[PDB]
Every structure is written in C-alpha cells, then in structure tokens.
Design a protein around this ligand. Sequence first.
Ligand SMILES: C[C@H](CCCC(C)(C)O)[C@H]1CC[C@H]2/C(=C\C=C3C[C@@H](O)C[C@H](O)C3)CCC[C@]12C
Length: 254
Amino acid sequence: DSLRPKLSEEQQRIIAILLDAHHKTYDPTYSDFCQFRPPVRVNDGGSVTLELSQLSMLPHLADLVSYSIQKVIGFAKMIPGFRDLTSEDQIVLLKSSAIEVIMLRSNESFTMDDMSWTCGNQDYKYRVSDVTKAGHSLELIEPLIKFQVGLKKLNLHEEEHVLLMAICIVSPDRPGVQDAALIEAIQDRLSNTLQTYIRCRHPPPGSHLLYAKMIQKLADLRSLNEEHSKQYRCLSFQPECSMKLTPLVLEVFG
Ligand SMILES: C[C@H](CCCC(C)(C)O)[C@H]1CC[C@H]2/C(=C\C=C3C[C@@H](O)C[C@H](O)C3)CCC[C@]12C
C-alpha cells in the first residue's frame, strides 16, 4: 500500500538550501577551536566541590557553545521561511532551540569508537569527564550520551540531519512565540520534505519507522534542554562564573 510521492522541485530546492547552509556554518575540521580559551583538565578523577572551585573546562566549552550559537543563528537565517517571521519570533525560536540544535549538530563530531566528541587533535576530544569539569552533573551527561548513541544508530543521511535541525528551530510550541500559525506553516513544509525524502530516498525501507524515531529525538532534546537549563542556573551561582562564559551565552541561557 504506502504511496511514495516524489520530492517536488520545491522540496528538492529546500534540501539543497539546507545542505548548503550547513556546509557554510559547520566546519567538519574544527579549525577555529584553537581560537577559543584553551581547555584545562585539572585532576578531579573522582568531586562537585573541586570543579565548581576550578571550572577548568568552562571557558573553553563556553567559547565552543558561544561559537556554535553564532553558526546556528547563521544556519537559521538560511532556513526557507525563517526570515518571513518577525525578528521577535526569530529570536524567541533561536534562544529556546540553541542548546538542542547544538546537541544535535554535535552528533557529527561524536564517535562510537570511544564515546567522545572528537574535534581534534586530542586537546579537542571531549569526554564525559570534561563535561563534569565544566560544572555539569551525570543527570545531564548520561542521557546526553544516550541521545548521541541513539542518533548515531539512526544512520541519518545528511539531508535528514539538516532537515531535523531546521524542524527543531522552527517549532511553533516554544514559549513566547507570537505567530504560532506561521511558524507551524514553515515547520510543516520542512516536515513534509523530510517524510517524502525518507519514503522515496531512504532504503530498505523497513525504516518507514524512521520519521517517528526522528520525532522522538526532538522530544528527547526537550528533556535535555530542561535539565541543561536547571544546571546552568545552578552553575551561574558560582561566584565570578560570568567571566568564564560569554555575553551571548549569558543572554541565551540566563
Ligand atoms: C552540555 C554541554 C554544553 C554545556 C554548556 C554550558 C554553558 C557549560 O552549560 C555539551 C553540549 C554539546 C557538547 C559537545 C560538543 C559540541 C560541539 C558543537 C558543534 O557545534 C561542533 C562540535 O561538534 C562540538 C561535547 C562537550 C559537551 C557539550 C559542549
């Protein structure tokens, strides 16, 4: 039974637009990372106290996340439809989705060889231990790694990955959005592009369950977003934390 309509010419052009936007905003060589404040790994082999006392990886990771937010804002601008929104909604959407899109886009440096984000170059291989040296706890980190493994095992085509990031950004149910209807219209155009693509371009397919899986990842990201927000708020109570962050990070997560 299941029909397999072909991608319209407009859908194909959406896909091409989104691949080009990603290629313009995600350097797969990580060649800017040497410009960030450097990573420092104090031995905390075991401690929340040590660690909040040092936050040795926070300057480097905050610069990394700050840089990623900028690339994401650049990616968003190229999403077909996004600029038809009011700038107030554009920013609501970017601010509420930023950490989720960072978590998604980070899947490209994530490796199941050793369960790290390998952006280098050894200095820029990030593990669970680095995330705890930036003041976060296992209640964020463990489900983050689960999410990364789950996403990897979907073996998404790049077309799927960039569509999934766009759909994440353009979510009509973010708090504070005004024109939810327009946002939903933009998102549906993207979601239809993704369903059609999966059905006509993705083999075998007994992965017609792929679309529901991807949608579930969006749900998972929502939970990670609330847990992140909870921890960031506590982290920010550390005296002089702000010096280790950036103005853009302060604004987005504050
Ligand atoms: C939870 C943490 C962000 C915490 C930021 C803070 C401000 C301290 O709350 C995660 C989110 C994404 C994670 C990682 C890498 C992300 C990227 C981003 C992407 O834009 C390029 C590359 O893929 C590395 C591994 C370290 C741990 C990172 C930074």
